[PDB]
Amino acid sequence: NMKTVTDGREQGVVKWNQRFSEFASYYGFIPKVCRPYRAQTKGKVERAIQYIMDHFYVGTAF
DNA sequence: TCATGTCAAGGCCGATTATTTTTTCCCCAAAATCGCCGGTTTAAAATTCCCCAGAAGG
Hints:
Layout: E1 6-10, E2 13-16, H1 18-27, H2 43-55
Antiparallel strand pairs: 1-2
This protein binds one DNA strand of 58 nucleotides through helix 2.
């Protein structure tokens, strides 16, 4: 639930940001939002974040 | 058909490979210990030879 993709739960239903909704309709992909304060529903990407931040960005210097 | 947690690393165990140390086996030579047989010595037991008494036979 990022404000760059939504604008709050209008009584349970989600209100999509108009510009982002236009962007999604342009590329055709349907957006979805998991839920407030529940990151389990997107465990794949969070675990990938753990993977990258404990494998790549641990000692690499730039 | 919605929404819905997933992946990697670390630790432990087992098996395999490599290195080192210890123990055993086989063959030969020398020394020591043990076993068997024979001979010698000691102790105990058996047999035969002379005079006194008793019993039996002619």
